[PDB]
Nucleic acid binder design. Sequence first.
DNA 1: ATTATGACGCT
DNA 2: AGCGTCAT
Length: 430
Amino acid sequence: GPHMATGQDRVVALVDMDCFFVQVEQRQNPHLRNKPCAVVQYKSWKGGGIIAVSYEARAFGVTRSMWADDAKKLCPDLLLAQVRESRGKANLTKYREASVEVMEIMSRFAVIERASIDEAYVDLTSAVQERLQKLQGQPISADLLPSTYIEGLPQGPTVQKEGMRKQGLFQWLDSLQIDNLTSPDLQLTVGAVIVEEMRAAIERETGFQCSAGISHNKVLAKLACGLNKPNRQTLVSHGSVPQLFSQMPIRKIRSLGGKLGASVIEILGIEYMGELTQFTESQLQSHFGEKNGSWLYAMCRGIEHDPVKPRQLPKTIGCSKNFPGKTALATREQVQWWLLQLAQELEERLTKDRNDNDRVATQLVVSIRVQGDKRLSSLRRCCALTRYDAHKMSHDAFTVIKNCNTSGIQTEWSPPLTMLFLCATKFSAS
DNA sequence: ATTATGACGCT
DNA sequence: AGCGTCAT
Ligand SMILES: Nc1nc2c(ncn2[C@H]2C[C@H](O)[C@@H](COP(=O)(O)NP(=O)(O)OP(=O)(O)O)O2)c(=O)[nH]1
Ligand SMILES: [Mg+2]
Ligand SMILES: [Mg+2]
């Protein structure tokens, strides 16, 4: 009733760059613009593995995780850009620097949470309060929302997509009570006005296009962002949640796409997020644990409390390389050489991080995978990181992993190593 | 032989 | 601290 909190206290947006690495390469090379194109890492095995796909190429069925050779079967005119290689491995520096460009623009409008190389959450609650005081009860013109979809509208009592977008927006705006400065729907609308401005600034100052979601929490903002990619933003109101979730497969919600979501489906005998509402909070906790149960009980009603963290910089800086099948490292000299290449990249990135961001990592995490282990990491060991020196970190990494070598022979390495991973963590202000 | 990361929960 | 899960 009057006391049931509805999770409508915040305005949260999620901004995600469209086919980000592709856009970075299309900015640099105009010949790739407005074409089916993809970004690949490496080349010799099956043409390289695709990690980003322009929307024109997606129309042909090209996807992330495809081998380029297979993608070319679906799209013979597909254009390809390769990730830079340095010290024998993929080097993603160009895309990290482009990411910093975007995140610095977003930070002008609000404190952001860097959630990946291409996306950030924004808590717009206070900015919305401010813009509402400025508006002085003045209604919001559809011209301020030129790329916004309102999820669930139009409804009730008309052929092309832009016309449908405008019909839905008109219905939404006419239903608005622009007098109540505390109306959650009005707050979301003003948030969407601000996100239009943020996306305009990103495109004007970088050339990059993005999509966004606007809702009352992070999960709904992320889901909304996906609904109308590319180059559009979507508002998911609290009221839109029952219909949206009534046919939403459980796996589409962030964090339910793996074993937990499968167990929700299997234990409860349900398929859609909306079906979760029929269970009590205690029932869900009994199946999925305290925290998961409370999270599911709230989230199927559109309510989620995870805060937008004030964090524009990544928490860790890491370097990793797989050595699949027959390229796996089987000698001590090989393991040392690749530990050194990874450590040299790490030292470069860490030194630049220290100069830019006034902090120093203090812990070095070494992870390996051995042949025949189906897990990501076969072993993880930490040691101290006291100097940004690649020879030192690579010698320390060897010292912490050398006991994994089954070979009594000192020259060989058995079982051979199919992955090396160095990660700098536990940053302190310097 | 999907790869290269990054986040975060569990014990 | 080291491992597992999720993500893409
Ligand atoms: N190295 C590496 N990079 C990856 C991987 N997967 C993605 N990336 C990189 C390449 C991606 O460009 C970037 C951002 O990932 P998204 O937001 O998930 N995809 P995008 O922005 O391309 O398309 P959309 O319009 O649907 O958002 O992360 C991977 O497995 N490995
Ligand atoms: Mg993206
Ligand atoms: Mg993303």
